[PDB]
Design an enzyme around this catalytic site. Sequence first.
Site, mmCIF file in Angstrom:
data_model
loop_
_atom_site.group_PDB
_atom_site.id
_atom_site.type_symbol
_atom_site.label_atom_id
_atom_site.label_comp_id
_atom_site.label_asym_id
_atom_site.label_seq_id
_atom_site.Cartn_x
_atom_site.Cartn_y
_atom_site.Cartn_z
ATOM 1 N N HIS A 47 0.822 -0.968 -0.217
ATOM 2 C CA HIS A 47 -0.174 0.141 -0.337
ATOM 3 C C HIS A 47 0.582 1.969 0.519
ATOM 4 O O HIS A 47 0.483 2.188 -0.326
ATOM 5 C CB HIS A 47 -0.707 -0.060 1.237
ATOM 6 C CG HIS A 47 -2.610 -0.684 0.741
ATOM 7 N ND1 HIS A 47 -3.279 -1.089 0.611
ATOM 8 C CD2 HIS A 47 -1.852 -2.009 0.574
ATOM 9 C CE1 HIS A 47 -3.847 -1.258 0.911
ATOM 10 N NE2 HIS A 47 -3.629 -3.139 0.579
ATOM 11 N N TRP A 164 4.070 -13.072 -9.035
ATOM 12 C CA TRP A 164 5.157 -13.596 -8.538
ATOM 13 C C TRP A 164 4.659 -12.662 -7.244
ATOM 14 O O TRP A 164 4.685 -13.627 -5.986
ATOM 15 C CB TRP A 164 6.159 -13.528 -8.899
ATOM 16 C CG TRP A 164 6.635 -13.984 -10.055
ATOM 17 C CD1 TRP A 164 6.361 -14.906 -10.141
ATOM 18 C CD2 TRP A 164 7.579 -13.706 -10.927
ATOM 19 N NE1 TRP A 164 6.959 -15.851 -12.100
ATOM 20 C CE2 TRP A 164 7.685 -14.483 -11.763
ATOM 21 C CE3 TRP A 164 8.101 -11.994 -11.599
ATOM 22 C CZ2 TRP A 164 8.151 -14.459 -13.420
ATOM 23 C CZ3 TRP A 164 9.357 -11.853 -12.469
ATOM 24 C CH2 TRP A 164 8.971 -13.708 -13.931
HETATM 25 CA CA LIG Z 1 3.381 6.002 -0.943
#
Ligand SMILES: [Ca+2]
Length: 319
Positions: A47, A164
Amino acid sequence: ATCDDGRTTANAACCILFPILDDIQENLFDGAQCGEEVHESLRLTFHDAIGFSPTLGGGGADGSIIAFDTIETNFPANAGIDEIVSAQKPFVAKHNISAGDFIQFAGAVGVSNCPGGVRIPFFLGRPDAVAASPDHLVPEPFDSVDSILARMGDAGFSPVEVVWLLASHSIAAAAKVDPSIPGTPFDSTPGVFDSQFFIETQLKGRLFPGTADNKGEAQSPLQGEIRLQSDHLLARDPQTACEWQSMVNNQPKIQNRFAATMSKMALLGQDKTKLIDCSDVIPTPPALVGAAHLPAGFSLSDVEQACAATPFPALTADP
Ligand SMILES: [Ca+2]
Ligand code: HEM
Ligand SMILES: C[As](C)(=O)[O-]
Ligand SMILES: C[As](C)(=O)[O-]
Ligand SMILES: [Ca+2]
Ligand SMILES: [Fe+3]
Ligand SMILES: [Fe+3]
Ligand SMILES: [Zn+2]
Ligand SMILES: [Zn+2]
Ligand SMILES: [Zn+2]
Ligand SMILES: [Zn+2]
Ligand SMILES: [Zn+2]
Ligand SMILES: [Zn+2]
């Protein structure tokens, strides 16, 4: 180079990491366990890093999700992320490394706690974040494969690299997808970095482990496991399904590709030649306990094969 407590590292500048390591292993990771905070910290690296778009901005792996938490943690795709961001903030405040550095460091240290796991290359020296990520940069579990691959490709990743990277879901749970069952893992060994995830995402769905109508959720093959609609599609879509299946019982490939591509993500928006390589501070992961297998009661007829070119590998199963 030898540091003040006698531990050694290739580059002397890496010595400041040793106390941070000690502090996070004990106080973030519950005594160097591969648990909840490792799962959350790994999610955090993604994130933070994926907030990177040539067209819309964002500085990538820069600590913005901590530095600008009020903006970023209220994005819908960041649901549930504020808890790990709050846990990590005090370590960043206490120590003398940048938020960006700390997020990647914590991710890499955590993964190193997991049997089967890898030591993700780690570089030190990221500057403080200077912008919040734009919204709409983090893939959501109800996004199409087209949308997901386009988003990830825009950030610099090919289809196979997305596969992956999703090895991460071998050590991952959800809290906000189905809030009636928070902390339900994506495979049956959330404490083990293995290919169980790739096997169980390929199984025919049977049930909803909690409620039945949640956005971004697909049927799970197993009670106490949750399946994302995004993982369901990626396992099955012609663009990704053959790569998906190739991870199965291919532990060397999982390790090799995850570490490489994680290093790439950790470096998004950054310049590797401006940073110092501190990879040798990350702990040695334990070895895989288990070969991955079919859960009890399942057989190969339970597998929805989606790779045209190669037949799903034979697998052992519990009796
Ligand atoms: Ca960032
Ligand atoms: C490729 C598209 C992706 C989608 C659609 C996706 C979606 C999700 C969702 C919906 C959750 C559950 C959040 C919640 O409700 O608590 C989650 C958890 C998680 N994600 Fe993925 N994700 C993707 C890629 C990645 C990548 C590249 C990584 C690599 C670090 C990552 C690492 C994790 C981890 C470790 C968790 C477990 C978090 C926890 O247990 O608290 N994800 N993901
Ligand atoms: C454009 As999007 C990453 O919010 O589906
Ligand atoms: C919430 As959306 C339409 O950007 O996937
Ligand atoms: Ca696992
Ligand atoms: Fe803040
Ligand atoms: Fe078993
Ligand atoms: Zn804990
Ligand atoms: Zn938590
Ligand atoms: Zn310190
Ligand atoms: Zn959006
Ligand atoms: Zn979306
Ligand atoms: Zn498609």
